Amino acid sequence: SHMAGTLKHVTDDSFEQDVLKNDKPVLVDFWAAWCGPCRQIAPSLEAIAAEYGDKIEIVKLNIDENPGTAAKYGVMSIPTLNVYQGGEVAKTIVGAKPKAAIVRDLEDFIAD
């Protein structure tokens, strides 16, 4: 376990390899740079990925750059955090929340 977490900006092109085929659960943050609530959660996700990096991986999907993946998962409010396991969404958190609330929402993945 480490003091920093990993981060990868995933694309329409990389989504299968990076997310849908991952061993760990992957929290995909569907965001945009003009979204204040997305900016708000970014330190929380950073802290979470460091704290629980043995359990979960955090990646970001910019919806301006990657439409498509957004539209595939019906993402029309941001931030939306989808956690993927086995190539499908297992948990969805829609809208910005405090760190402690995100961690509760992630309990089934990061309690182990």
Side-chain angles (χ1 to χ4, degrees), residues 1-111:
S1 172
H2 304 284
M3 291 196 68
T6 68
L7 182 68
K8 180 179 25 192
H9 293 96
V10 295
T11 60
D12 288 340
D13 192 57
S14 83
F15 207 84
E16 194 188 310
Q17 288 312 289
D18 292 324
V19 178
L20 304 186
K21 299 174 168 175
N22 210 65
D23 285 357
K24 293 205 234 242
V26 177
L27 186 171
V28 180
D29 171 23
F30 287 80
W31 75 292
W34 45 264
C35 176
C38 292
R39 297 190 297 262
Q40 287 194 343
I41 70 158
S44 299
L45 301 171
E46 174 170 72
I48 295 166
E51 282 159 11
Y52 302 98
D54 59 305
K55 299 300 322 256
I56 198 163
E57 292 179 18
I58 282 47
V59 302
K60 289 175 180 182
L61 186 297
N62 180 291
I63 74 161
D64 288 333
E65 291 170 346
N66 297 104
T69 283
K72 173 162 175 183
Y73 294 98
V75 175
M76 307 179 78
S77 296
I78 53 165
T80 280
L81 319 179
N82 284 345
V83 180
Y84 292 78
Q85 226 169 179
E88 306 201 353
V89 183
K91 180 80 191 169
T92 185
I93 310 173
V94 181
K97 297 189 183 188
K99 183 194 194 279
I102 295 167
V103 166
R104 284 184 244 114
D105 283 342
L106 302 170
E107 200 190 324
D108 293 332
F109 311 95
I110 75 192

